[PDB]
Amino acid sequence: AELTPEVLTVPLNSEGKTITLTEKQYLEGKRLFQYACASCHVGGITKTNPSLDLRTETLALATPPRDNIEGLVDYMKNPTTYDGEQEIAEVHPSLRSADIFPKMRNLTEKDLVAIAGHILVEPKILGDKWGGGKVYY
Amino acid sequence: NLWERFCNWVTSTDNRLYVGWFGVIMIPTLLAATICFVIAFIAAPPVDIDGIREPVSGSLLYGNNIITGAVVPSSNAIGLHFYPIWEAASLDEWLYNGGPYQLIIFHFLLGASCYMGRQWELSYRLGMRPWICVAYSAPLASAFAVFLIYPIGQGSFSDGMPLGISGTFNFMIVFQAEHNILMHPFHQLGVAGVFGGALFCAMHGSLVTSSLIRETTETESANYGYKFGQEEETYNIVAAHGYFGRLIFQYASFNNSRSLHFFLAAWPVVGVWFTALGISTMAFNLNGFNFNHSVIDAKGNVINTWADIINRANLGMEVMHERNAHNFPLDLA
Amino acid sequence: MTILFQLALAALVILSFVMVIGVPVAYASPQDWDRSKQLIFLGSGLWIALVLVVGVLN
Amino acid sequence: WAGNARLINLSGKLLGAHVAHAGLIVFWAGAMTLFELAHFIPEKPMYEQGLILIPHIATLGWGVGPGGEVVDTFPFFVVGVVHLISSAVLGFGGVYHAIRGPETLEEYSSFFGYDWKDKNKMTTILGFHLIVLGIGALLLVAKAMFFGGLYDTWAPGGGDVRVITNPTLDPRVIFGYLLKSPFGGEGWIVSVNNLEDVVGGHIWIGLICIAGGIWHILTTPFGWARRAFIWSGEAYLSYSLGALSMMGFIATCFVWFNNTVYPSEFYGPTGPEASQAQAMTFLIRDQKLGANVGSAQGPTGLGKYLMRSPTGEIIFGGETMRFWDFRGPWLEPLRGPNGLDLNKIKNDIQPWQERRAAEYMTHAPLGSLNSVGGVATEINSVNFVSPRSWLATSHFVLAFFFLVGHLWHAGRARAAAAGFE
Amino acid sequence: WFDILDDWLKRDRFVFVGWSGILLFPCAYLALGGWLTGTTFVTSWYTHGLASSYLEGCNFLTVAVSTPANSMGHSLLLLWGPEAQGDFTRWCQLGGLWTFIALHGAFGLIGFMLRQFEIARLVGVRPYNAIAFSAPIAVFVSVFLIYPLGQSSWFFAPSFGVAAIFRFLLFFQGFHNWTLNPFHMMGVAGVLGGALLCAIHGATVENTLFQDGEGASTFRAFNPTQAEETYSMVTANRFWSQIFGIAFSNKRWLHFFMLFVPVTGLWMSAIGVVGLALNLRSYDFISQEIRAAEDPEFETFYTKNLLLNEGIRAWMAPQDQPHENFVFPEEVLPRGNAL
Amino acid sequence: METLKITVYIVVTFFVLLFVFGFLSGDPARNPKRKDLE
Amino acid sequence: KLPEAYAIFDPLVDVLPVIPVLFLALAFVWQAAVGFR
Amino acid sequence: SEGGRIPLWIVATVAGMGVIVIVGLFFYGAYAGLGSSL
């Protein structure tokens, strides 16, 4: 019933290779999420745009695909509308918009990866809840 | 010359009451509230609490029974503004936007405040101490807290606290669904102050009654009282202090009458002192505790703590309070 | 020199640690004030000086 | 253990105490400023951590660029230290004066420092302390006009520190604020919009303090004043006691509804800010979904986003209709005659505005003891509690108890005069 | 050999152990330990699904001793109960504690009123206190026995904890609208009246105390001969009479009336609960409901409340009652627009 | 209704001057039962 | 943390600001040593 | 007043401060578990 490797054996890229995270990282994921996210993304639900969540399934239908890490990393650096036609850097946190989202200024590649990991491991634990807040709604 | 003859009147005993400088405002004020209020409850027309165009009518004539409700809060449009009569147009209007509410409230607080002053001032004309002024201060402060501070902290008198029995209940419910009070020490000490007073007002009067002067003109067919002229007073305090002391332990019992009656006025007053604060503190959003999650890092499986089933109820209610008056996802006030 | 500030400070530290404990006992009339009062203008003299050293060090 | 009441008449010891507690007030000033610049992290919303003085220090525009946290770190360390040492400078004083020996029998001294029941000397001592406020007040003025500015949150762009010129010194304007309805958005002192009013509003105080300090110095109270007030020592506390209470309230309410004085940038967003911020945040969101904002019809028939105010202007609809009195730098440019311009709305809306809406809307003053952020129902993964709710909350409390104090000590001055003592 | 024990036993020491002293202490001790033991060491999620103790990390408030599982009805599962089969650990897993605490604890209450009778016939005082004490005992049985009896089982009885009690409150508001019951209203009357008395009495005294009784002017003295006591009824009287308008001045009445208010109240409240035990409630106003359905432009606070309730019931009953296994699809749940 | 607003204020302030001038009062001042200092 | 060179003292600085409260504490001990009067 | 007398204002301070350390813990401890809440 403990946290297992499989649990952390998350998809890394579109094709089919995977990486298995560690204990140390996982935790940094939360700590970071809470740091520049939670406020707007509490429990994995957009407060500013409720019709768009962070559940795994909804991320795969994005453009470009986002059910894996490389995609999220790309997003955190530069943003992409659910379809991929607008540059929302002047609106959403982005390493490219540090100057406006000071919380981002400090961040590093290692941290993005972990943050991404937190978002992909959570659902395996929380299930429906992390989605639209079941226990929470 | 006349001016002197008037003051003397106001200042001493008038064979009915004492109406000092404080009751010079208290008497005409609390009257306007009474009258207005009695009539508002017997005929006021519906009033739309939240600006929405859905009037609620909690008056006798408009289909209510006593518990069903009364004088409803001002509109949420006029919500925080000053809504006098002159300031509006026809009374048909006024009556719809909750006028009676403000009018009644404000006069009542002011005169409520003065009813307190009056209490002290009588002390000054009778050479006694100034304490009763202080013990009243607890509820008064509380009324203000509920009728003022909150609507002042929240942004509109609407949802102050309805002047009906039923709405009292509503205010309560909505309230803990919005700020979660149950789990706030100030309302916890509140229940302490009150359940306190109950346990003590029963304890005292109970003992005071058990240790009476068993032999003073009391037979089995008659029971007649004491009067100040009565020296030894009614009871044998040694019997009571002996009783209580033997029920738990020596310290537990109270030696003298000061520590006894001081306790009786200390527990309740300082309990509500806090509660009245409780509300005033949650008037500016410093809501009670909320231990929503305890986990099993094993997998992170969330374990529900008794408190979550409390949030499960607090939840259902949030969802439906002020149905259809919300256009955006999260309430912020 | 990082060493001077690490000592000037720890210097003003220990002085205060003492001062705050001594100054009060010193006002215990039946324990000679002659001896105790000397040390006083000393901690005070010494202190306000340290206060200015640290400052000037930046 | 009324210990502090045994001290009543031996003014030689009160000085020892008043100057002892006067040492704590300053001690806290350092212990907290240093504790803050300690935990303090640069570029993270001052208020999302849990600070209170620094925000004050940046208010005076001591160390900041256009609404930019802090470019210069240092300015705070100065404050942290100074006050922490002023605490010893006085700890010494309070202690000494408390323990080394009483007062009132020093002949040359009694000429410089007298006692109670002596209207002419109490008056004189009073004026004195009045000449001091007259100054401190005027110093604030100095720090805005000929010194390193003050933080103006208004026009334009970012409102960094700016130096003021010719403060609103009109005789009328200043007391007008005193003569205005303390209701619906308009609180006499709180209504203060323009930072220049605030400067000029301080100049007049000092002149008034000083012109008064000296006044009582030279004059002893008239008859009417003598037959209204008592003169016991306890009674002067009752006066001063209740004065502070009112103010506790004063400032509290003053805290919740910001005037440029409390730039929401450090302190956070105003209770209404959040709501109004949430309305605006969504006009845009749907505007981006091509929604027409003028014809919107909410389940009530009031239009989701736009409706009117009793005096007939346009305001964000929804419960946030009760905060149309709200005014800030972000929401204003859309303001114009008749209310909000439906044409600047859908045409001239810059992006940096959505940001502020979202941020504020996101950090709603709403919080609990567990520092849980947001609605009473949220999950514990977000920590926050708007400084304002902290200041408003704690400070309300004191203004209350303190009033209880106005009653207790003033009612006991009626027992001295003849009652129970 | 008897009378001796009477005396040895009834011997006036520090802590009076009377004849009743045998029931009281063994029971009032175990009823306390029972709580504190589980509170600190037991989990009740095999029986309730939640976290019971500190062992799992609840705060004091959260921690409690949870009620048995609804599948068991009213079987007192004592250690040797056919169900626990003597295995302690499980006897705890199943909640065999609740029963423990309520039973032993019921007798501790029995002992405490008995000990209140003893002391009155040794000292020669009136039994009144022992009688005032019935109210709480009523409230207790009413609550923790009568109610669970009437319903499906032990589960629905209050849970022994802090929060676990608040949840009780709310439960009642949703399914019973207990606040509308008149009985709880009167109960609500005495409790608030008990505190109103406690203030006026205590403040009046303290403030009408005799002048100069102490030169130093503080008030820490008395004596037996201080027959008259430290204060005036004559002045209080006039004080009240002129401020409030009324004031029965006869000390003996004042104190008794102080017995009537609190106690008279709790008896009602307890009655009110014997009613709910049988899902017999004051949750409706036929008159209103009727006009509430034939007409949609008519609403009163009576109504607005009945709405909140259903919200309480829909959202809170599937997690709060694990045995029926409620499955409620998002859509289905009642829900105001936007929230 | 403007006629009403006016009428009120008169009434209100009227009873204010009676509070204020009732206290500053040189005549009744602060007269108690145990001691009169005049 | 921005104290730079003083780094060394986070500790004492951290438990620092509480002392104003502990002042209240001695006050009662002062009393205990003096039999409460 | 210590002629070598058996202490009490010490006992009163020993436990009093002792208790603060146990409770203090109880607060620390209240952090180790809710802290992984999500």
Ligand code: CLA
């Ligand atoms: C039957 C057992 C029972 C018990 C033991 C408790 C116990 C408690 N309840 Mg609960 N409650 C119960 C049943 C029970 N409740 C029921 C059936 C309901 C209805 C569902 C509730 C509803 C309820 C609510 C709604 C609340 C409580 C709260 C509380 C706490 C209140 C604190 C207080 O001030 O109380 C009043 C009592 C006193 C002030 C005095 C008790 C006597 C003390 C221990 C004496 C100390 C004296 C010392 C030893 C000697 C000094 C000697 C002197 C001479 C100097 C307390 C922990 C409140 C709370 O804060 O929750 C955390 C609260 O808000 N309860």
Ligand code: CLA
């Ligand atoms: C302007 C400031 C002020 C001053 C200088 C005084 C001065 C005095 N008061 Mg008054 N008082 C004040 C305000 C003030 N008071 C207020 C606002 C109230 C209303 C609450 C009172 C209520 C009051 C009462 C009811 C009494 C006095 C009395 C006295 C005399 C007391 C001597 C004594 O025994 O102290 C002893 C003091 C204490 C033991 C302090 C208790 C303080 C609380 C319990 C501490 C709470 C802190 C808490 C633990 C912190 C938690 C941490 C936080 C971070 C969350 C003294 C002349 C007494 C008297 O007889 O007057 C002549 C008296 O009976 N005062």
Ligand code: CLA
């Ligand atoms: C607000 C804070 C406060 C203050 C300032 C005072 C002040 C005072 N109290 Mg009161 N007291 C208070 C709270 C306070 N009390 C409370 C809450 C209670 C209830 C518990 C009491 C109960 C009380 C009683 C019962 C009595 C007093 C008495 C006194 C007087 C004692 C004078 C003396 O020489 O003592 C002796 C001094 C000492 C033992 C020394 C203490 C030394 C301090 C801690 C040193 C701090 C270090 C110093 C700053 C170092 C400087 C170094 C430099 C280089 C910078 C003094 C004016 C007494 C009295 O009769 O007064 C008329 C008395 O009997 N008080």
Ligand code: CLA
């Ligand atoms: C609230 C603000 C405040 C206020 C209003 C005061 C007010 C006062 N202070 Mg204080 N002070 C304060 C804060 C404050 N202080 C603080 C924060 C500190 C700590 C830094 C001090 C430290 C302090 C000290 C150290 C002294 C004062 C003194 C004085 C008094 C000076 C008046 C004067 O004319 O001295 C002018 C001085 C003189 C006329 C000195 C005459 C010298 C004596 C008589 C010599 C005795 C020796 C003799 C040879 C012995 C023969 C004995 C035989 C057996 C051999 C005055 C009442 C002085 C005082 O009380 O002493 C009189 C003093 O010495 N204050």
Ligand code: CLA
């Ligand atoms: C530190 C505060 C202070 C205090 C405690 C006093 C106290 C006193 N003053 Mg003094 N005064 C002060 C400051 C102060 N004054 C200043 C700054 C000035 C310069 C304008 C004066 C000018 C002054 C004069 C000209 C006279 C007094 C008089 C008196 C005595 C009047 C008796 C009385 O209160 O009657 C009853 C009081 C009232 C009817 C007034 C109630 C006023 C309310 C509470 C305050 C309103 C304040 C204002 C609106 C706020 C400013 C807001 C800002 C934004 C601009 C009393 C001892 C009289 C005297 O001593 O005679 C010889 C007198 O004739 N004072």
Ligand code: CLA
């Ligand atoms: C920081 C500045 C500030 C300050 C100090 C206040 C202060 C106050 N506000 Mg205001 N408020 C502010 C900003 C401020 N507000 C802002 C920005 C808004 C915008 C939303 C509001 C909105 C607001 C509302 C909606 C309400 C208040 C109310 C109050 C009062 C509550 C206490 C009370 O019950 O007094 C009772 C009265 C007194 C203690 C009288 C003090 C005056 C002298 C000393 C006595 C005169 C005596 C005589 C008997 C009474 C004559 C009064 C007259 C009106 C008839 C208090 C005076 C409440 C109120 O009662 O309105 C006035 C209220 O309902 N405020």
Ligand SMILES: C=Cc1c(C)c2cc3nc(c4c5[nH]c(cc6nc(cc1[nH]2)C(C)=C6CC)c(C)c5C(=O)[C@@H]4C(=O)OC)[C@@H](CCC(=O)OC/C=C(\C)CCC[C@H](C)CCC[C@H](C)CCCC(C)C)[C@@H]3C
């Ligand atoms: C908050 C509610 C409340 C509490 C906690 C409370 C408590 C107490 N009242 C007593 C007495 C009284 N109370 C009285 C009237 C009242 N008491 C009231 C309300 C309360 N009274 C009210 C409203 C009244 C007015 C009717 C009277 C007239 C008396 C007394 O004569 C008596 C006294 O001497 O006064 C101080 C004491 C009896 C001790 C005893 O018999 O142990 C025996 C039994 C024990 C120890 C346990 C029985 C088992 C129960 C079921 C278990 C309780 C265990 C808890 C669940 C565990 C702890 C929980 C924590 C949250 C605290 C006890 C301190």
Ligand SMILES: CC1=C(/C=C/C(C)=C/C=C/C(C)=C/C=C/C=C(C)/C=C/C=C(C)/C=C/C2=C(C)CCCC2(C)C)C(C)(C)CCC1
């Ligand atoms: C209780 C009481 C009282 C009181 C007391 C008081 C009032 C006190 C005070 C005190 C005080 C008022 C104090 C103060 C102190 C201070 C201090 C002790 C300080 C210190 C400092 C230091 C040490 C420094 C710091 C620093 C710096 C500056 C820089 C950087 C680094 C550092 C951090 C190092 C009396 C006697 C009346 C009586 C009895 C009781």
Ligand SMILES: CC1=C(/C=C/C(C)=C/C=C/C(C)=C/C=C/C=C(C)/C=C/C=C(C)/C=C/C2=C(C)CCCC2(C)C)C(C)(C)CCC1
């Ligand atoms: C089960 C059982 C048993 C046993 C047991 C018992 C009887 C127990 C008990 C137990 C107990 C008996 C326990 C306890 C614990 C406790 C604790 C852990 C406590 C704590 C406390 C505290 C911490 C406190 C504090 C405080 C403060 C600080 C302040 C305010 C007030 C107060 C007082 C609250 C037997 C074998 C018989 C059989 C059957 C079963």
Ligand SMILES: CC1=C(/C=C/C(C)=C/C=C/C(C)=C/C=C/C=C(C)/C=C/C=C(C)/C=C/C2=C(C)CCCC2(C)C)C(C)(C)CCC1
């Ligand atoms: C020098 C120095 C400093 C300072 C310090 C201070 C200022 C301190 C303080 C401290 C304090 C200020 C402390 C205190 C403590 C206290 C205590 C420890 C107390 C206790 C008490 C008790 C234990 C009591 C008891 C009791 C009684 C008597 C009665 C009633 C009940 C009771 C039991 C509660 C610093 C850090 C800056 C750094 C540098 C150096």
Ligand code: OEC
């Ligand atoms: Mn009367 O209410 Ca203060 O919560 Mn949200 O905002 Mn309007 O909805 Mn209910």
Ligand SMILES: [Fe+3]
């Ligand atoms: Fe009594």
